[PDB]
Amino acid sequence: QFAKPEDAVKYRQSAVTLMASHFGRMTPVVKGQAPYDAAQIKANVEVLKTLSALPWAAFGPGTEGGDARPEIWSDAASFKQKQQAFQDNIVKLSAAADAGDLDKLRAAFGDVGASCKACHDAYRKK
């Protein structure tokens, strides 16, 4: 859907800004510093689920740029596995949010966060 490669870079950077806000806005809730409203978090995690699928289609072939390391394209199977791990962790976070269980939420949230950091450590320019 991108007229030029720069358009894919702009799209993915926007997508990761959104996904990051929908993840990180739950930090105070997971830490107990903000109240836990199960419905609020269920709805938010549904948004995060949709957003979490979007960046990956904007690393198509030819969209080299931004802070994406080139190893994203040359180790395509290894990058796909960091992305799949992250998405399966998002499924576990959805399950926790749907269950309305703060303990389960905290654990799943930590797993998600670890998966974000693991991909950045390998595939995001420093």
Residues that bind ligand ASC (CB under 6 A): 20, 23-24, 113, 116-117, 120
Token pair recorded at residue 123: 């595939």
Annotated binding residue 13: yes
Taking the complex as a whole, how short is the minimal distance between the CB of residue 21 and a copy of itself, in angstroms?
5
Phi and psi at 68, nearest 5°, equal: -80, 120
Residue 96 interacts with which of a copy of itself, ligand HEC, ligand ASC, none, CB < 5 to 8 Å by class: none
33 interacts with a copy of itself by CB under 8 A: no
Give the Cα separation of 98 and 9 in Å (integer). Answer: 33
| Chosen residue from 9, 29, 41, 105 binding ligand HEC by CB under 6 A | 9
Indicate the residue among 61 and 89 with the shorter CB distance to ligand ASC: 89
Annotated binding residue 103: no
Characterize 14-34 residue by residue with b for buried, 16 or more Cβ atoms within 10 angstroms of its Cβ, and e for exposed.
Answer: ebbebbeebbeebeebbeeee
Three-state secondary structure of 53-91: CCHHHHCCCCCCCCCECCHHHHCHHHHHHHHHHHHHHHH
Taking the complex as a whole, how short is the minimal distance between the CB of residue 53 and a copy of itself, in angstroms?
8
Binding mask 79-108 for ligand HEC (x = CB under 6 A): ---xx--x----------------------
Token pair recorded at residue 41: 């978090």
Detail the residues annotated as belonging to a binding site for heme c: 12-13, 67, 116, 119-120
